[PDB]
Amino acid sequence: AMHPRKDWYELTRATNWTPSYVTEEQLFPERMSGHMGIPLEKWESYDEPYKTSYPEYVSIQREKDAGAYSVKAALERAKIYENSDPGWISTLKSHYGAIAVGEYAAVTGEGRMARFSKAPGNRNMATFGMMDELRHGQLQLFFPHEYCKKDRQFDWAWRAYHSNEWAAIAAKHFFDDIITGRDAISVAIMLTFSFETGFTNMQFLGLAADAAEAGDYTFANLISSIATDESRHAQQGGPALQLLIENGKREEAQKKVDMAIWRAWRLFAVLTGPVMDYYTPLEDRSQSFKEFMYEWIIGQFERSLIDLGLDKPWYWDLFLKDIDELHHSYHMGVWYWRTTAWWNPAAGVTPEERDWLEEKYPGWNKRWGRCWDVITENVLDDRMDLVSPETLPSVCNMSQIPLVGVPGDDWNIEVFSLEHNGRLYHFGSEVDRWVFQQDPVQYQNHMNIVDRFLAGQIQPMTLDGALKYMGFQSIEEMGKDAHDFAWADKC
Template sequence: MPRLSRGDWYDLSRDTNWTLRYATEEEVFPEDLSGSHRVTGEAWEQWDEPYKIGYREYVHNQVTKDTATYSLKNAVSRSKLFDRLDPGWKSVILAHYGAITMPEYLAAIGEARMARFGRAAAWRNTATFGALDEMRHGQIQAFFPYGLLDKEPRADWAHKAFHTDNWVVLAARSLFDDMFVANDAVSIALQLTFTLETGFTNLQFLGMAADAMDVGDLEFGALISSIQTDEARHSQQGEPTIKILIDNGHKEWAQFLIDHMFWRSWRVFSVLTGLSMDYYTPLENRRMSFKEFIDDWVIKQFAEQFRDFGLDYPWYWDKFVREVSWYHHAIHLGVWTYRPTVWWNPDAGASAAERVWLEQKYPGWNDTFGRNWDVIQENIRRGDVAATFPETLPMMCNLCHLPIVRPAGVVVGALDDPAPLRHTHNGRTYLFCSEPCKWIFTRRPERFAGNRSLIDRFLAGDINPPDLGGALAYMGLSEPEQGQDATGYAWATGE
């Protein structure tokens, strides 16, 4: 075989299906784990991966990437580069490691499920490489922050975060459990590899790697680049899976799965990436605003694939497009106000120069959000920092588990969802931040009804004492771990 070209042996080596004799299709590919029985086994044989690779090539590529990335880390770790990074950018790193490291390990479960329960041999082969990818991503993103512990002890939240009930983690864990831990192979292919990876994270990693290099964070830039090249390959499992479903008359199911997860991905993506791009990245290093990024890479480019595959835009598309202009700004204001509840130091990003930039990128920002920062800034200048902290907990959405927010200064009737939305299921009333979140819940309430938000836990008596201090202890945040203003309020005082 070493003397043959890959085209001479590839299809033969990967096509390992056989006729079952001692077990039924349902026993080998149970629907709860496979999700493939809408389509016949013969039809699944048409599944063909866009990116083809053999094990020898895979190992060679991964060794090369690891050698380069770990060598760079070893060199950088002996320097003062991290110490010289902008405080806001350090928060980007800490937020990323805490929210993403453990989900990378969990994504290996999703890939392994496709590697075992995908109906096509070609699909199982591709997913096997995907599982190896995700294990590597978890390991490398746990190892890199470990090297920062002597400089930033909260880097241990790369491992600790998902072992706590922090409110950010509750939201992320709910998303990833829904997407791949508690999901079937077909749904994982559409919701993880197509919707999240192709539509959001693959693009995000490209941008983050470039931003890291711009701010001088060579270590993080190399890490993210190394991961992105894997994502670009195994994220392509969604495309042939969508094609099989549509060709066999199941466009409606494919559309539902994507509509469902696009909204959920957008919610968490806007929190992590929106805050990083528009507030935490140093002003001089911002290549584009978060809105410009979404417009160029999601609305114009990724969304075109909906039509290329014969799908429609999600039914809430206009709502999504409008939210790009304000949602992450509202979340940012909440995260900064509740800064003790997160494991990084939120950067207000509201200095005079930054406010000029925000108003240019988001006309009307000063009228809707700037006036809130005016009050905060005045309290800080008067020495009343205590007035900038919350006294109670916000309402949380029972689907995405993020705070229910609205932009200040906007006429209530001008919003799509002007007030928290309600739905009663089995005698209990659930609250939602948006119509799409409510729609996802009501389509499959049995999937989400038992997933408790932080407020549910508060009302159930799990948090003692029932105040902000009790909530911080419940979320695993000791005083040294609690977030503070990234610049020590220099943005407000002009110092």
Template sequence: MAKMGIKEKYHAMTRDLMWDPKDYDYRTVYPLVEKEGIILKDPSRWEDPFRLAYNQYVKVQSEKDGIYHTVRNAFEANDGHARVIDSRWYEGVKAFASAVQPGEYMAHRLMTYIGRHIPIEAVRFATFNQAMDEIRHAQIEIKHYAHMSKMIDGLHNYQKTGQNSWFNTVTKSFFDDALTAGPFEALIAISFSFEYVFTNILFLPFASSAGAVGDENFAAVGKTVQSDESRHMALGMSALKMLLEEDDRNIPIIQYWIDKWYWRCYRIFSVIATLVDYYPRIRPISWKKAFEIYVEEQVFNGLFKDFRKYGIRLPKFAEDSIKEKEYYSHNTMRILDHYKHANMFRGFKLQPDDYEWLANEYPLFEEHYAPYFHRSDDNVLAGASKGLPGVCTVCHLPNEFPNPDNMAERWTQLSEYNNKTYATCSPGCKHIFDHEPEKYAQIWWPAEAYVNGELGTDLPGDLFKAWGTTPEEGGEHYSSDEHARWLEHRRHLGLDKKYF
């Protein structure tokens, strides 16, 4: 018998695994496959571009896990936490933990949902592998946070914080939106819009920052997670092309999904912009430069030029995101500073080198944002809000973004639905709400829920119980007990000594 090549092996090990229902109607087994209006003519010709069989997948992932855990064990054994250049970095790690790790688990659920409802063998096998990737990422990150919770605040009641904190509703609303969409929309939302367009800007800049400040553990987390993303990106690209090539009637449906999910992904990455520009004391790259490289150059000027032959244009609000790159991280940091007393991670007073770097990277920083942050130089709570924010009905971010064409004007938009007024943070989110108002009108608004007593009536005490945190875990970093403990740990290890 002739030896099989890679393509033949892939077909032998991944095809003919589908259940062909004989006693049940096809539409009963796959009730969602026609609900979105997507036309499938011959999906059997579509293949996973990686042609990865399960035994190969297990071997590769096992090797990557071995490398990561070796780095993690060394970091933990050698007091790596005390060796970062500035402990405020870990406030950013807490924010990343709160925003990203729950998303990894939700992405795992999404991939199983997509695989269950799209009856295409190659899609099903690719989403099966990605579902395992996502649960691996979630477990790796939880392992990291479990170790860090021994040294830093904010992570000791992680499950409750992830369920109830107002900050976490941004991530939850995004993935709940995708999970309640049809399977083809969910595929475009996650595999294309999230994975292909934005995954590089999620992991590469922040992992580089981790390495620059001395957090080798988190740098290893970023690298081992990012190493899976090439497969995820390939799935998103090939699935999108497959749907576009199946039938021209799919094109307007997919164009709306691209418009919607580009903006939804972009808004969820607002926190990443701040983590790149503010929390590391050494910054390998700014958010603006990362956005220009990974989104403008690679996606807008590269990928979407190739899509013109299908009749696909740039996402509807791409130009707005380009305008916002000058302000995005600063405005999000200001929002976080407003509510630093109500989070499981702290803000901090900017240092002279922070002002210098930000002014050099962002010419408009001095005029529009430096005066605000200077207010905290003598009073760390000078910018703190007395309450919780009113949030966007779609993305759940506070309605506190300025119009990039007029910085003195709030960008908040209003929509009417069923005799009620709903606020959104931007034209992009308003467009999404107006297209599906019945979906987003069901918003669970944290501030309203707290005021109505859903999480207790003893305010603010019951709020912190619901969040799984304490008031001491918010506020300002450099004046906190956590920072004092970190300095003492360094003194104990002799890391504060200087040799001339």
């Protein structure tokens, strides 16, 4: 006979003890552990609600990978790359470049917790979390690897995080702040709770729904399988949050969640926003970016936040307004500076698409539509010099993304600046400025790509010089319009 897990599970997490040959603080130093002075005894009530055991883990994950790889193998000849819309291929390039090695970075966040969390249950679930992020990183290298021979841009599935390309810097700045650069309890709260029960669902399930509409079942099956792991190890954050609230640390827990959510929002607005409203072919848009946001972040994540005993963030109404506006301007920037991307942005402004954008965001044509009109006329007149930039955009000192606002009829743009220790910083939002002020030593001597440009670190100090600095190795890898402006035939 076998004995049921409920009967022996407690022994697997009976692993705390009172150190005698070193101090408790030497064994769990605050800068790595983040226990906020809560003594060891209090961490033993931590109870992970989504349990697993080593025998079940290796058996179930063997079945998950067998499914993912069997589907990839059976569809190798489905002509997805050849028959897909170029904007869909661009979505794959940006996803794999932005995610794959960041997943491998998440191994280090989970490892931080496996060594330095004072909660024995957390250290075991973080060990499975380490394994899950290994899976995620290896899958999302293995899958795009077969396209290297079609397109040098898929090399950026591996190369992006090794580059100084501006969007790789934005992703690394975020993940190094939330995942690899903070103590174990911060990781539990900012990564597993805030990011992996919130925005990760936009990218791995919202995009899966678009992939299924587009007919890419290898990709949809892949990223939805990845999300099943996230659903288990993301449950490490809830009990840590509850522990901090019950030990007098509600304010600190709220601040970390507030910070983490906003940082993820700005990055996912530039990566997922353009994908869902512009790169994905119209007929394959299952919902708009805003409708997905209201499903996954407002309807699901924010409600779960309240259920755990936390409050709506202080920036709630700022966040709702950003949802209507930010990614439209991020899209325009990524497109206008497409030569700095490792994918080929789709402009996505044929009349058919402009009608859909107007229905999903009333007033779109009077705002971003005004810029796309000038761009469209220049393409129709063969003034291609007017649709490529000769300067760089100003970049947020927090998100590492260009400083944007609403263009056109009711133009409004605000930079939120900050003098700090003899340096002038510029931020794209109130909240980004606030995030900086919560932890200046984390950020104050970092230099964004434009800071480096003006400091002489980018030679020659030209757009061409920035492209060499960003790591581009051939003309083919620089981004171009996804359709080679064939959409202008529709205008």
